[PDB]
Amino acid sequence: GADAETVQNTVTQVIEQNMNGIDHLMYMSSNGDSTGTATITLTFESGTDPDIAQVQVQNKLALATPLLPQEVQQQGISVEKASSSFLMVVGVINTNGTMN
Amino acid sequence: PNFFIDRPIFAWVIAIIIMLAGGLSILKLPVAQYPTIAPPAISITAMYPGADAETVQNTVTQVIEQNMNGIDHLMYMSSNGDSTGTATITLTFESGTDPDIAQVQVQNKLALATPLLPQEVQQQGISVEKASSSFLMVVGVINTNGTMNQDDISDYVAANMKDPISRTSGVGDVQLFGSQYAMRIWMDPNKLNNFQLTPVDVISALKAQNAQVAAGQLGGTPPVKGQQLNASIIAQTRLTNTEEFGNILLKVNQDGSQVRLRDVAKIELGGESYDVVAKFNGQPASGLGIKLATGANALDTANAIRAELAKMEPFFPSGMKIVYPYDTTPFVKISIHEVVKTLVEAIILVFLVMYLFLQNFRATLIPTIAVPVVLLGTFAVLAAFGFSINTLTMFGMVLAIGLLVDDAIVVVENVERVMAEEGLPPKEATRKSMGQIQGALVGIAMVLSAVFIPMAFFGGSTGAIYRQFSITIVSAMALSVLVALILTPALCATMLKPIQKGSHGATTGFFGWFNRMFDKSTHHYTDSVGNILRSTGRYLVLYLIIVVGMAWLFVRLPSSFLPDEDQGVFLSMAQLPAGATQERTQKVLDEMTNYYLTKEKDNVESVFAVNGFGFAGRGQNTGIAFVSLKDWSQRPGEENKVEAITARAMGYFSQIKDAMVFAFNLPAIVELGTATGFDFELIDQGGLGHEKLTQARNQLFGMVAQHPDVLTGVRPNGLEDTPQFKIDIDQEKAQALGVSISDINTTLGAAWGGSYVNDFIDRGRVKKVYIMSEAKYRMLPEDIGKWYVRGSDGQMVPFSAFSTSRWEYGSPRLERYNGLPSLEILGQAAPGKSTGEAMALMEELAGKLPSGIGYDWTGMSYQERLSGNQAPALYAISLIVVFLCLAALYESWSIPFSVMLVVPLGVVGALLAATFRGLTNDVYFQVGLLTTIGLSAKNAILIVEFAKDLMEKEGKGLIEATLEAVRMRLRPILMTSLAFILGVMPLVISSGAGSGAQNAVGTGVMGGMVTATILAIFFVPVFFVVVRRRFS
Amino acid sequence: DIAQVQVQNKLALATPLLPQEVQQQGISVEKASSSFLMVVGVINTNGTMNQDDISDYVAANMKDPISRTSGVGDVQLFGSQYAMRIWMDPNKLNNFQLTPVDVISALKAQNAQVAAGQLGGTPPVKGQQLNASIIAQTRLTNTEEFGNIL
Amino acid sequence: DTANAIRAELAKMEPFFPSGMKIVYPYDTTPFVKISIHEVVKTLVEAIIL
Amino acid sequence: LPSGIGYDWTGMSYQERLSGNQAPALYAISLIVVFLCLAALYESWSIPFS
């Protein structure tokens, strides 16, 4: 229940301002939605170990988490390896039109 | 080498690829003063606002400590909690531990332990960081005008400078010396009592007013069929300025009059915390310290920081001014430049010495284009190993100078003298010379490898330092041997011209005079050795005397880790007694600042005094000054060096009765302590308590007062007990009235320690909202009765109605070690005694302590205990390998002893040089000692190899072959010795920036070179003759 | 190590959904083998201490340092640490019109470690000469203090 | 290595045990490992001798 | 565009720029390596130069 500007000021800016000093950080991008979702994407230099990068990102994020609003801490913060394309889209239809 | 004598261009392209790799590595090599030396440490910091030491320890520190299980490679953990409400748990890991993995494991364990912590502690947040107390630079912001105070400047820095600085490449942790803005609400107990309000009501209203509502959407799914508009709903309005917070409604009276927050409190934009106050030369200021990042050029990062600050300069309003009150980068640049100058001058002096002895321009050109190739390849292999350009690496390259120039001079001189004696053309002379010395060079490389590689396997921080030195010198020596077998023979074959107009035909002028005089000296020398070889028993007795003197000097010489340097900056600390307020400490710091800026106006350029902040710990008693001197050029003379300045300040600061103020120089490495010091923990192993542990510590101090001949300067590392104010709540009286314990505790805490209610958005930044009393109403114990709590019936009840007060003693700072209550004792060994015997005596005295009181060793004492007697074993293995390699080279089990007996010959000179100059037995001294041993061993190896070749190939007698050998090998020894001594001498006589390490490197190696050459040239023929006569 | 990091990262998203009692007990993510490396037992040869006393000693003095030893995946105490056990009586509770909720609230209120701030803390008035910590209320330490709770 | 570290830690703990309290070792699998390795090493030495 | 409005390439464009930027150095290094290898093999500077 936060607008995009509120998300930017409250969560994205804090997290991204703590995301400094990470090794082999190529570039960083962020966005804040009106749905109340903040996404920070750290892209590293090609050849960087993704596990060490994830560990370092978790290390920096833990410092920023207390500065975040309490509601977003209750929701939880996910640090995951990121891809921008689908490998596959497996779809499930129902013949006979039985189920919506 | 015969392969590359006929292929000069192959050798040239090999040298070209080596130099290109070296240049590429130099471009991409991190530059820092020192590498990662200390074992990795992880700091867990939590703040419990308003809590005392006991509250912090019993609600935070113990809970976190009990859950720090399952972490890998943990050596020890120590924790403390002080009256500021701060818990600091430091976990130290083994040297090889990956800091990222250790930190993530500690953070995961803490996160699993977080729900067990008080809500206030969780709200403040617990920070897990890699402990690194190394300020690369601190940049302060002052105001010429009086407009901006500490809080305003600090808020500006936080909101405009910290982010751009942290964006700069190669930056790390940043600590703002001020505090960001906050919405401070200063409650008045009288105004609250007038309207029958308590701090609880204020907290509730503040929490209610600031909120965020998930209001939803206008056309949210599932929508009605035919819907055409979708829009999000924004419901709750967050307060942004002080007027809105004042407008908050607290209560409505019967007549309709409204009790706003203005009526009961003063609302203003103040700082988050007022504990830390920083002033720069007496002016209000706020600064931010910078930590260096991994794999980053410290010089480049400093330049980037300065560029960013310069680009942000025009935006600063009014008299805002950027000031640098503390920086280490210029010292690093100066020291590295001095090392590079030493290398260049070493090359030039090699050129000059080779011309003086050979009088052949091309023969001088040959080594001048060989040593730089070795240095560049050393940079290449250094980068390949993952190392950086630092003080240890650079001074290791300086110590390696003798080896590289020795190899180049040996090859060139042997070729030249074969060309002169035999009259061979340059190519044939080169092939014959390489035939003579090619195997000996490989044997020398194998021997020298066995004497430096064992250094790399020492443990701990000292092991890391020795590993840096060992890898640098091993790489340089191996590459120089490789170059002497590939490039140098080809250069001798091609560049050198045939010797015409006779041999040494130059007879007129200084060079002719030198040739005549050196021929005489060589003849006198050979006669002397002949005389020496006539009766070798007396000279064996003399060598025994020399060895005994070596042992005596080695025993006498004091030991140390690293030299203290004049980095241009030093630190001053003030410690006020018992419960002294912030104002008194500020007065003391102002007196110190006035002394520095008036009595030390020539040397001191600026002093950055910060009140309430300390390296050891926080508190209103503590005080730190980042006093920075001028450039080394502006301060000539020993009286204007940091040591003299510190001595004069301590002379002045010893007469300050009110405080206990100290001034000291920066340690070389902070983690390393004094080599004579020990870190002793007095652990409470039996649940004795704080008082019994303190009594045990006092008894131990009484015992350490006896035996002053071993222990000196023992002292606690903590704080003695101070009076504390005890507010005791009577439960019966509290229940008799309508007052509730939660209300009482909330009122007391929110009044006297403050509460962090919630956040608000200020100019697009989230800032905290705090409530606390006005300072007027929380200064004295009488002010307790000014506060009232509402009963159930609606009647305000004074604190004096249900409570009593008393003054009792408590600990301002409690500490634990490995999960048990502890007291940290730190001291030093007596100057005559050593660290080991001091530690043994401390262990015995701790054993005399009462039952249930344990002990342990931490810090450098832990590593000393962990890795003891390792150096004798590693050097014994080194001796075994050297003997085996020499046996392989000489095809005999007895000849190697003639070479190996030259070690004391150089050790005596190193020890004498250190003793006469009043130096110590530090890391630089030991590495220079090893390089001296290597060079003397190489000289002895070449002499013995030449003698054996004369005896076998030429079929000459023992004495005849020995004499002819030393005659042949004299010129190279004198050439290399003169070049190395002349190159080293500026280090010995230097007195500028970084001259401590320069003197430590130079003096030992110079003395070792002088005595090693002088003694060896006469004792290695004796050793060879004695060995050959004794066996076969 | 990476497996544990990823597992705990996934767990952190589910922890706020768990009951408060489960979080209060504490969750443990461990990388340990199923089988026991060794069992270390403690025996009182005097015969005075019984299992509970021995177990408390082990929990309070041996369990944590062993757990922090490198390479120790998990430590199971074959017993339990001492705790302040309040054994309620329904008849006595009914006589005084008291429920376990009242006992819980009384324990929360009268067994608490209070942070009461400082006497003279920052910002101070101009001329302040004394700064002392305020001690308000500490957690109870023995059975008598708990029994004395009103 | 873990068993050796545990035994060292227990040795540190032992001088503070109250009176009759004693550490026993009812279950341990590392002694079998080390004794088996020693048996194989003795087998190798006997093989050299033979 | 007006002042204060910068730009940057990301995603595939970042990699495309990086490729174009590092292409000349690749050619230079490859040519130098080939020249040095030929000089080593043929023991001449004129042969590789031709």
Author numbering:
A (entry chain B): 51 to 150
B (entry chain A): 2 to 1033
C (entry chain C): 101 to 250
D (entry chain C): 301 to 350
E (entry chain B): 850 to 899
According to the publication:
Purified KpAcrB was then reconstituted into lipidic nanodiscs, and its structure was determined using single-particle cryo-electron microscopy (cryo-EM). The three-dimensional reconstitution of KpAcrB led to a cryo-EM map at a nominal resolution of 2.82 Å, enabling us to build a model of this pump. Among these residues, we obtained very good quality cryo-EM densities from the first 1,033 residues. Therefore, our final structural model includes residues 1 to 1,033 of KpAcrB. Interestingly, the cryo-EM structure of KpAcrB in the absence of drug indicates that this multidrug efflux pump forms an asymmetric trimer in which the three protomers possess distinct conformational states. Similar to structures of asymmetric EcAcrB, P. aeruginosa MexB, N. gonorrhoeae MtrD, and A. baumannii AdeJ, the conformations of the three apo-KpAcrB protomers can be assigned as “extrusion” (conformation of a protomer just after substrate export), “access” (presubstrate-binding form of a protomer with a vacant binding site), and “binding” (conformation of a protomer with a bound substrate) states, respectively (in a clockwise direction as shown Fig. 1B). No extra densities were observed within the periplasmic drug-binding sites of these three KpAcrB protomers, suggesting that our cryo-EM structure represents the apo form of KpAcrB (apo-KpAcrB). The entrance of the KpAcrB periplasmic cleft is surrounded with residues F663, F665, L667, R716, and L827. In KpAcrB, the composition of this distal hydrophobic patch is F178, V277, V611, and F614.
